[PDB]
């Protein structure tokens, strides 16, 4: 009774995962895009430092 | 800036302190030859080395031959599924695989885990030094003649020994074609790739044989020394 | 003669191009590549920089001189310069004879090589072989050993040619044509058992692999140097006009012509090397 | 009858949703970011090497100051290296040398590391006596140990290979959450940045959603042909990017609780070991194991540059807290830092 | 989401013929070698035939071996076995497993115990 016991269990989980509330990829992906320029500033790796405030010169 | 300047020398005399002890270590690390034991429950892979110590699920066995140190690991405690803990040793000297070779029915089963480590991306250059073992179980299974191995190997109909073929003395006619059969059914797979990069050294052994551990020593040599010979392009 | 003279200044400008270019490409490999800064490259390093210094400080010296047939220089350059060139090419000589040695261990004591060739030993071979290559060179020329205004030829005498001769040159090829030999039978006796493994596949070993290697390694060894010393020895024994002029200047460039050949022997001819240069 | 009735209704879920992640999709992150500007090329300079492990390294964790990073080497080696002055902190000689992962613990105090041993191994940095020693062994998993995270000083996740995460308790040394659903080996964990969720990526190609509190799996993501093998959550939390076996990497939305973007080339052939991003989370840094790290633009999928530096596989990379710099190990045994300059 | 559906199978008297046909989807089917397996009651699973990325290899078990033909159709994302002049000794549930990484030459965990990338299975009876 192995195979019935995780069958359950898996419809189970599928139910949780489907009662979840879903945003439109165009908000998700909105969000994102502003995150990305609200910090671009402040990414040495994006914007390299002067090498001045570089520790690894 | 002097208590920078006293934090920067105690800093640097930490280093030398640590790149010592790492020089010590490199000689232990380089002088010991790793080796990865791989076998199913079957086969006896456990008792193919006549110091033995249970790292967690790791089992490790240290031989020395010839003062020369191997370690043996043996990876006990995963699932069946091996193809991410495999990557971990990558960089053994060589891999130990041990098959049962009376037990016919699980006989391709072995066949087909020496060709997945064979053929792996990772272990594209690492020797397998394959143990046939239980040949004394093999020797009795033939002469009983109760199971054929053409009922699971039908090209074995077909199959005629080698010439070059040692069978050992007072050895029936009939055992030396199942040995060599089974043997030879390994070098189909370690022979159709590899580019010289890597070799399969078979053995046969039982399991009362106290001379494997001199044959790991002998093959360990002759991987290096062809891995040596091919880098100067002497083969 | 004139048309004579030209030919050879082309031969002699191109043997010392091959040379220097040569050993720069195995100098320039090492320095781009991490993975061939290792401890068994550092004698092919040692070896193409000495030949480099050859082909830069000996080598325009020596045509300039062969051309011309006289030595404008002083006399106490002539000095300085016969005695680099008696040091890189003893350097040079002795190199390929820890080369070989290396190469003995890796092969015939493969387990434990990488304990045996610690790079302390490393070092104490380098500075043994420069110890020796300045004792015979700069000591001996200096304080008259080897002693016997327009000649600038190295001088040798009776003790000199002997010692010289057998310590740089005639003990190494000994010692060299031992241990080429038992690596030549191992590398044919695994070369046989790689061949015989399955009836069904056909040989992937040339059988004669490693007799092609070892006969240009040792053969351009011996070619190369063998006459010079053979000269250079009757030569101290039965003066310097025992030996013809003209036989003299060609033994002479045949052990210049060893240093255009050691990039190609073991460094064109190693895997690590070949693949660096693709990388480079 | 029950048993056939069931994996029927699942069928039915799933379809379900599909249906709904579908719905939600009324655009694509690719067309959304079509107007911005790209980020150019990328050039990243190698500005330190740390040389002194022997063997692959497998894993590196930054702490959070951007100076001090724990490398683990499968020659049975924890490292501690001051990356401003490639100084070597401590070297920890570990007890099992088939190390897979390491953590830096967020106040600096501790490091974790384990492997096929199947424990999760504390060290304590801090000591009176002035060496580091081993703290706690956290046993209880059943498969090697491929990841692992503190949450603070007295709490850290695991994964495993024996298909399940778990949360310990590191005084008691017990876990007192464990995450099962996955159906493979988990390869790769990462934390939220309030630390309340944590995404994994196993090798049944899915990345799972947890609840560190709860101790369930809240949401599961697929879309990766094979296993994944390296994961790392957007620095806001809303997003994660996954690597895995089939050369692709994957942006995936919480919210939208479905792919956004994939990030892959024709020539690119080869798996994918490691994945991060930058400060503002514009790039991602992915470890492959053809040798090289390909930086990728995060929102165009644009292939921004490339850290050609080490001779073998590239194990595993990470960028430090404060965005300055990326260290790359890699199965060569080193360990490289990389940064642009203007 | 990786997914393979076996079809096919059922009773067959013995010395019959059956085919197999897996439906793959999930992944480029093009870039995989495709397994066959079968797990006999009371017994493991056993690895039966495999397919190579472009069809040009193919292996098989020798208890099988000249009595069943693998093929796949790329374009159609489609595996096939022909099991003709069946044994009751070849009553099993019989797997489509698919290489877990693609362009390789190995695969590792096909026959486990528990394979992500393993379908539902069919099942195929050969007793009278
Ligand atoms: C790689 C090997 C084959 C290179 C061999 C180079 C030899 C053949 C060439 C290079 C230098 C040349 C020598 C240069 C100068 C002289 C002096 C002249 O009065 C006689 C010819 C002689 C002696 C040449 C003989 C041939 C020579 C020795
Ligand atoms: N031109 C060769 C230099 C030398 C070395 N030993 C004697 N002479």
Redesign the interface.
């Given at each position: 009774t192995a195979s019935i016991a995780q069958a359950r269990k898996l419809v189970e989980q599928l139910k949780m995962e489907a009662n979840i509330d879903r945003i439109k990829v165009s908000k998700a992906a909105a969000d994102l895009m502003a995150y990305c320029e609200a910090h671009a500033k402040e990414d040495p790796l994006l914007t390299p430092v002067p090498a001045s405030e570089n520790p690894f010169r | 800036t002097e208590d920078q300047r006293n934090e920067?020398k105690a800093?640097?005399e930490?280093?030398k302190m640590?790149?010592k002890?790492?020089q010590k270590?490199?000689?232990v690390?380089?002088?010991t030859?790793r080796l990865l034991l791989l076998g199913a429950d079957n086969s006896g892979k456990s008792t193919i080395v006549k110091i033995y110590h249970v790292?967690?699920?790791?089992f490790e066995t240290k031989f020395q031959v010839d003062k020369?140190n191997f370690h043996m690991?043996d990876?006990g405690?995963?699932?069946?599924?091996?193809?991410?803990?495999?990557q971990?040793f990558?960089?053994v000297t060589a891999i130990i695989f041990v098959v049962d070779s009376s037990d016919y029915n699980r006989l391709?089963?072995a066949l087909?885990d020496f060709?997945?480590?064979?053929?792996?991306?990772w272990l594209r250059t690492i020797s397998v030094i394959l143990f046939l073992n239980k040949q004394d179980l093999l020797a009795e299974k033939v002469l009983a003649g109760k199971s054929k191995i053409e009922?699971?190997?039908?090209?074995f109909a077909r199959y005629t020994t080698?010439?070059?073929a040692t069978p050992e003395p007072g050895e029936d006619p009939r055992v030396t074609r199942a040995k060599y059969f089974i043997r030879?059914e390994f070098?189909?797979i370690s022979?159709a790739?590899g580019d010289?990069r890597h070799?399969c050294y078979p053995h046969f052994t039982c399991s009362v044989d106290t001379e494997n551990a001199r044959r790991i020593?002998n093959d360990?040599?002759?991987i290096?020394?062809?891995?040596?010979?091919?880098?100067?392009?002497?083969? | 003669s004139t048309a004579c003279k030209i030919t050879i200044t082309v031969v002699l400008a191109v043997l010392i191009l091959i040379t220097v270019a040569g050993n720069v490409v195995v100098c320039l490999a090492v320095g781009l590549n991490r993975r061939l800064r290792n401890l068994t490259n550092c004698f092919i390093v040692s070896l193409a920089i000495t030949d480099l210094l050859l082909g830069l400080l000996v080598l325009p010296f020596s045509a300039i001189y062969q051309l011309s047939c006289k030595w404008s220089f002083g006399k106490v350059f002539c000095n300085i310069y016969t005695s680099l060139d008696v040091m890189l090419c003893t350097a040079s000589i002795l190199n390929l004879f820890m080369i070989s040695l290396d190469?003995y261990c890796?092969?015939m004591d493969?387990?434990?090589?990488?304990?045996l060739v610690?790079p302390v030993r490393v070092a104490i071979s380098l500075v043994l072989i420069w110890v020796i290559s300045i004792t015979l060179s700069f000591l001996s020329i200096h304080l008259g050993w080897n002693s016997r205004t327009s000649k600038c030829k190295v001088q040798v005498n009776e003790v000199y040619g002997l010692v010289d001769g057998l310590v740089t040159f005639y003990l190494p090829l000994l010692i060299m044509c031992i241990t080429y030999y038992r690596?030549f039978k191992?590398?044919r006796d695994?070369?046989k058992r790689?061949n015989?493994?399955?009836?069904?596949?056909a040989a992937?070993?040339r059988e004669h692999?490693?007799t092609v290697?070892?006969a240009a390694v040792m053969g351009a060894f011996i070619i190369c140097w063998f006459p010079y010393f053979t000269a250079f020895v009757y030569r101290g024994l039965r003066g310097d006009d025992a030996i013809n002029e003209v036989l003299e200047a060609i033994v002479l460039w045949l052990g210049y012509a060893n240093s255009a050949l050691n990039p190609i022997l073991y460094a064109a001819?190693?895997?690590?090397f070949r693949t660096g240069y693709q990388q480079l | 009858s029950e048993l056939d009735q069931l994996r029927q209704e699942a069928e039915q879920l799933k379809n379900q949703i599909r249906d709904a992640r579908k719905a939600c999709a009324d655009a694509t992150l690719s067309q959304i970011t079509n107007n911005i500007d790209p980020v150019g090329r990328i050039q990243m300079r190698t500005r330190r090497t740390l040389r002194?492990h022997?063997?692959?390294i497998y894993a590196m964790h930054w702490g959070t100051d951007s100076r001090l990073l724990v490398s683990a080497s499968?020659?049975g080696?924890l490292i501690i290296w001051?990356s401003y002055?490639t100084?070597?902190?401590?070297?920890i000689?570990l007890?099992?040398s088939?190390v897979?992962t390491c953590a830096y613990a967020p106040s600096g105090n501790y490091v974790a590391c384990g492997?096929?041993?199947?424990?999760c191994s504390i060290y304590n940095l801090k000591t009176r006596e002035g060496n580091v020693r081993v703290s706690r062994e956290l046993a209880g998993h059943?498969?090697?140990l491929?990841c692992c995270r503190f949450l603070d000083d007295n709490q850290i996740v695991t994964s495993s290979?024996?298909?399940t995460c778990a949360l310990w308790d590191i005084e008691t040394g017990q876990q007192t959450t464990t995450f099962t659903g996955h159906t493979?080996?988990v390869?790769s964990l990462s934390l939220a940045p309030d630390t309340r969720l944590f995404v994994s990526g196993a090798?049944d190609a899915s990345a799972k959603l947890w609840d560190v509190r709860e101790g369930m799996c809240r949401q599961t993501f697929t879309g990766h042909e094979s296993?994944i093998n390296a994961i790392c959550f957007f620095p806001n939390g809303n997003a994660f990017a996954t690597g895995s076996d089939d050369a692709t990497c994957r942006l995936f939305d919480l919210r939208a609780d479905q792919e956004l973007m994939t990030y892959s080339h024709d020539n690119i052939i080869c798996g994918i070991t490691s994945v991060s991003f930058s400060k503002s989370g514009r790039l991602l840094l992915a470890g492959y194991?053809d040798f090289n790290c390909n930086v990728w633009d995060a929102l165009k999928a644009d292939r921004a540059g490339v850290l050609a530096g080490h001779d073998n596989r590239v194990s595993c990379l990470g960028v430090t807290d404060d965005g300055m710099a990326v260290a790359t190990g890699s199965?060569d045994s080193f360990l490289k830092i990389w940064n642009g300059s203007s | 989401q990786v997914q393979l559906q076996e079809s096919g199978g059922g009773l067959v008297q013995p010395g019959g013929s059956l085919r197999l046909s897996c439906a793959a989807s999930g992944f480029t089917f093009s870039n995989y070698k495709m397994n066959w397996v079968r797990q006999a009651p009371g017994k493991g699973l056993?690895?039966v035939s495999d397919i190579s990325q472009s069809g040009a290899s193919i292996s098989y078990?020798?208890?099988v071996?000249?009595r069943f033909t693998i093929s796949r159709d790329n374009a159609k994302n489609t595996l096939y076995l022909q099991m003709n002049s069946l044994k009751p000794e070849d009553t099993a549930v019989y797997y489509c497993a698919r290489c877990?990484?693609p362009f390789?030459?190995?695969?590792?965990?096909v026959?486990?115990?528990?394979?992500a990338y393993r379908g539902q299975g069919t099942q195929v009876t050969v007793s009278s």
């Open positions: - | 920067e800093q640097r930490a280093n640590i790149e002890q790492l270590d490199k000689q690390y380089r002088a030859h790292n967690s699920g790791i020369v690991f990876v405690a995963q699932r069946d599924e091996r193809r991410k803990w495999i971990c990558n960089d391709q089963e087909n060709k997945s480590i064979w053929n792996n991306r009922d699971y190997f039908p090209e080698p010439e070059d030879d070098l189909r022979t790739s010289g070799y020593f360990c040599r002759d290096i020394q062809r891995m040596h010979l091919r880098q100067y392009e002497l083969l | 190469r890796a092969v493969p387990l434990r090589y990488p304990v610690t690596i191992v590398a695994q070369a790689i015989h493994i399955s009836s069904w596949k992937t070993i692999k490693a290697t070892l001819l190693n895997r690590d | 002194g022997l063997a692959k499968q020659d080696k001051d002055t100084n070597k902190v401590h070297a000689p007890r099992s088939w897979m492997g096929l041993d199947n424990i059943t498969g090697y491929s290979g024996d298909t493979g080996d390869m090798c296993d194991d199965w | 056993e690895w078990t020798g208890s071996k000249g877990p990484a390789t030459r190995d695969c590792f965990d026959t486990s115990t528990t394979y």
